[PDB]
Point group: D2
Chain length 417, copies 4
């Protein structure tokens, strides 16, 4: 069984997946080894991911390794229906994912996924792992381990750990060097603006753009907003990233001060209610708000809907809320990750490395079953470094190597004058 929009989209989905593969050579090399070695023979796997052409290439690599996989959507609005159709029709992979599905459907998919009795859970935001631990304690004996794709899910796993309920190994994929140094920064930077421009066709040049958060994602978004000619305001809660943002040329201020000035607001904090009613109240007429953090809770949309006297779709992915004072607030993507909701997410070039990490993390869990302590686990350095070497080579870039004389110099300490 499966639950998708339209099985007839599989031929289009097959073509989209092959296009995306053009820039996933590291994952393709992993798939080919998996086809030989079958690391997941006999393993049941659940993946809660954005159902995109990039996720399909990861699902196909796990299929080649022998995994009995079931895929559900990580977000109601990021699903690519033609991809879902292709995975069902061409690979026989159960997919429960419909673009635009409601909340009841999403939760029912999570339940169907746990009924698959997975041994490995690939999660993106930790919804499925949190549901497992809260509602399916009786299933924990099935678990070899889990993996977590994104920053928000890592925070949830720490909270699970500190609550004493992370009773199995969980691979921190997000914090691998070849994941958040490129995916979170360069990918979010391009695809966030992609989603905004597809939604609105607004000229970014000459606009004031407010980026909440200056971590890996915020650095990318601010960098690319600036590259497209915007005046960039950064907000923060920590002084180290705040100083960095100033020395990168951006204006740093509290959100209450930014709210008067922004034309476009982008949240990338991983936090709740970063943009609040006290902020909507002072925004310019026609201000655009959107979110590129994992959950929409970064913008208090519930309060906006309550205050507004009217909402209407004015363009694809674009809603205009009209406030009782007659001013309007424009929301893109209903507050969901704008790159995936209004565009196609990150280019496959960065997802190659992110999903290479996912594939090898799953292999790590199986090859080390019964030898990993419960709790969080970093990607092994050798694996992280090998992904980077292979990606650099596939990009056609050559670099230098240390000579034996340089190796000797590093190990020396008496010399230097």
């Amino acid at each position: 069984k499966y639950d998708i929009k339209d099985i007839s989209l599989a031929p289009q989905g097959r073509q989209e997946i092959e296009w995306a593969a053009r820039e996933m050579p590291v994952l393709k090399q992993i798939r080919e080894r998996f086809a030989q070695e079958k690391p997941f023979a006999g393993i049941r796997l659940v993946a809660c991911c954005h159902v995109t052409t990039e996720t399909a290439n990861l699902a196909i690599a796990l299929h080649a390794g022998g995994a009995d996989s079931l895929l559900i959507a990580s977000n109601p609005l990021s699903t690519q229906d033609d991809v879902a159709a292709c995975l069902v029709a061409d690979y026989g992979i159960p997919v429960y994912a419909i673009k635009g599905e409601d909340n009841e459907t999403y939760h029912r998919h999570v339940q169907i996924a746990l009924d698959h009795r997975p041994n490995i859970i690939i999660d993106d935001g930790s919804d499925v792992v949190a549901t497992l631990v809260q509602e399916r304690q009786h299933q924990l004996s099935d678990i070899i381990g889990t993996t977590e794709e994104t920053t928000t899910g890592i925070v949830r796993l720490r909270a699970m750990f500190n609550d004493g309920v992370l009773t199995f190994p969980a691979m921190n994929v997000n914090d691998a060097d070849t994941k958040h140094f490129y995916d979170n920064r360069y990918g979010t930077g391009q695809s966030t603006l992609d989603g905004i421009i597809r939604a609105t066709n607004i000229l970014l040049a000459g606009k004031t753009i407010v980026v909440a958060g200056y971590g890996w994602c915020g650095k990318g978004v601010a960098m690319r907003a600036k590259g497209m000619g915007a005046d960039v305001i950064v907000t923060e809660i920590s002084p180290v990233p705040a100083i960095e943002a100033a020395m990168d040329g951006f204006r740093v201020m509290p959100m209450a001060e930014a709210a008067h000035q922004g034309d476009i607001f982008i949240t990338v904090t991983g936090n709740k209610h970063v943009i609040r009613p006290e902020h909507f109240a002072v925004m310019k007429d026609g201000a655009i708000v959107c979110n590129s953090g994992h959950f929409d809770i970064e913008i208090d949309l519930k309060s906006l809907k309550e205050q507004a006297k009217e909402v209407k779709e004015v363009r694809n992915f674009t809603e205009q809320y009209i406030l009782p004072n007659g001013k309007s607030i424009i929301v893109i993507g209903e507050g969901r990750l704008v790159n995936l909701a209004a565009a196609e997410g990150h280019p496959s070039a960065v997802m190659d490395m992110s999903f290479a990490n996912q594939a090898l993390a799953c292999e790590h869990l199986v090859k080390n079953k019964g030898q990993l302590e419960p709790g969080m686990h970093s990607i092994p350095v050798e694996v992280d470094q090998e992904i980077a070497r292979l990606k650099l080579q596939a990009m056609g870039i050559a670099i230098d190597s240390l000579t034996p004389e340089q190796v000797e110099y590093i190990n020396s300490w008496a010399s230097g004058t």
Copy 2:
């Protein structure tokens, strides 16, 4: 006793030190607390640092804390003679440092410094700590601990540790967030180009600039070279920084390929012989080479002097080597850190944080004497974070703070859908 160029420069040096203090408010606040609390009462201290207006403000803060300090130069060419005169004449601090001193003099200063029988050694490159361990094993009982300012010295300390001879605590100042995130990146970026432009008055726009190394320093130099209109080539030995440099818009290649194309070469690798005779051989006529890593050994200057049939000073800090084929290679600063040799080093704004870390690391060593294991020690997070908070405040920048509702959200794991 002391060993300086000219005591009569103290009035000029006093004015230079006060100017530099305009942007060192975090260190000034530390000095004022030190004046009250006298943490270094009865402590003998040796500092091997670049004798600059920034180092003077740190020396004055240690003096206010009661330290019996002696200062020697970290590099023969970075000394500011008027600063040396002021510290001797106005504070009575022994300074052994002459701009342009030869190697015999430098080594004799190191010996005089160890004869001071220090309890704390502040080192910049680890020369004095390596000399202590190799030649003064009988003095180790004096040592409360040491600190290390820069990346090259950290590498030496690891080699000492792995050789089993790091038998005392050593504070890793360089790797504090408020040190290498700003000093190594934003400071080196501006002051490296400062030194090059003061030496030559070359238009950087339209030149090809080759940056060897894409760590904290290389990121800054490349960023600012690009900001000044240069075509930037990056060389590397590791794939993670190499990919970053490409996604930042720079051309990544092996040095053998870069050597044909560069107009200006800047080494910031911390490594030996990054630019070798096989590279000089193919450089454009008039190519400029310089170094911003701690030691000049990054450029094989010994071989260049041997091949050249002639050398002459053509401008301040600027030497033209003429090769037997009649082509010329231009060397700035005799291969020594070009920012300090041809200009004035980093602006005091970043050295405020670097030397705030130095001052509190020394206080940490004394307040925890007899409770630190031998080996390397990171700056405590609370200290690192407090420097950043105080610097952000002194820069006049305000940011947000987490509400209790957001704190609750972070500690929650069942919520998120």
Copy 3:
């Protein structure tokens, strides 16, 4: 009446036109003056433009001015069918424009437009004016004047003038300060990369991108490619813009040297066959070629078709040509204007100033009928400056004004 795809798209086109109008405040003010003063009463007008939400707002303003207008597509791939439906159904403006129309349909539409016997012709690339001068010498008595939107069209008019056949006033809209300083530069800079990304979802960071031409468009394309993390090569034929590109941090080289290195090629020259058979042969496997200058002839696609053993459609707006050695060349938008073929063209903020220039140029032609010398006329300085003043004000930006003593000091020399 009209020739369009589906009139049932009119309500969607209306919503799209209204969305675009949000950032066309200057043209809005012009439309409202036009509806009162009716400067185009009794005037027939043909517009040959990209049939976009921005052109619609222009057509709506001319219609408010009394103009009996007829619109045809400047390019078969840039037409927005919902916009064509809205203009016909909501405004009664005849539109001859179907997205994807073939060449015969295009040329038929141009003949239908000339049968309107226009007094004013707004052109984009000069196709209709050249046809008029060539085939309809008897209709020149109708012509009060024409306008030309784009750089390629200005060059063709210059050739028309030098040939001695430019026997009427033509307003050079493209060279207005408030046109090519912004439209050609910032407009093309964003919308060109927009089209590439919508076609391919390729990561620009880390790629070598080759920009042919460093005029207004190339400056904009190179600036935004750099801002998205790309390594930028520029090619040129003139030394002055070539030195600018180097001092802007870009590599400058002949296209034959760049052909071995680029991952993405963008032509913005206005000239013919800038990317040539001998470049395709040495390109990297999977290199992308696209064009942002007015006509697709910037790329020698005919040669690529005969060099390739196979061509497949692999993504929207994207063709993969496979050469006998198995290497691929990717073409976006069949070589037509990549911003308008694979995306939506310039954001309406810049089209506000370009189309304010069109509207006031048409007013200029009518208010000066029988008084203008034949040939090309630049936009009047006061018109151009007042557009900039209205736009800056609409952007919410305030600037300074000289004091009486500062004005005095300018006019002193002692």
Copy 4:
């Protein structure tokens, strides 16, 4: 004979002049043609320029051309004393220029220069030409023509023309493509920040920097300030450059709003009193003000002096004004050209093209004696283009050339 600081500096000045010549290949080629053709034989010439290693290379080229030249300083703070020594001692060129000379010495030098009875005057800011027109109406019969190096001077000449006293040809060197596209933009962009950093060693990253003016100089200053990590505010009086600055990512606002926010203020307007008493009163404690336009009058330093209770010299080229409330305002270079007062002026790469224009303009004036209309003359296009071609070639950059079919296609319109 001459009036200089110390002739014993000649050998050091020679080494400095030779170093600068390395990146003046175009002027080198001109000098070598001049030494053969001797276009200035029997011609007397006055040059009022910044006495730098770059101006020396110009003077050396004119001397090779047979010119009987006399050089005086354009600005008391920009003079390089070793260069003045080398020109006198090694070339026998009379130089009247001492770094730090007072106002009376400057005006005396200008009178000495006019007593040379020059046939050609090379000016920078138009001080000597205006004095000639004002006080030496009897000497106009000597004048074959003059040249003007900088934007401020072109404005003064326009006022001279409109007043009716520009009774001779003046070559507009500043507006040559190969002059203000590079000198004014990339030259001032680097050398202005160079002067600030040499004066203060302040970190630019993290600072708000206010650039008054977004012409060629302001574009360059803003571009490089941004590249060094600064938050850039731009002020303007014209909407067209104001919209450019916004679309370049900069904040645009009136100077009175910027005065509360800037850490560093840079004036590049050519106008009088752009930073005013009411701005000083609201500036942040320790704000830095400096000027990069030709004259120091861009900043109302007289008002600052009367608002301050105290002034101290705290660094080279740096004054600290302390206001009654204890807040400080920092002035660099006494408000004179910060790049030339606190550093060395433009790198010689761009002065190569500016001074190639000077040299060929002087040749133009002499080769066209008695044939030129009175008034201002632009640099001839072929001169300007050939300078760009020689410079690009000297930079080692190769570009493309149109093929015969591409030339054909330009000239077709059908």
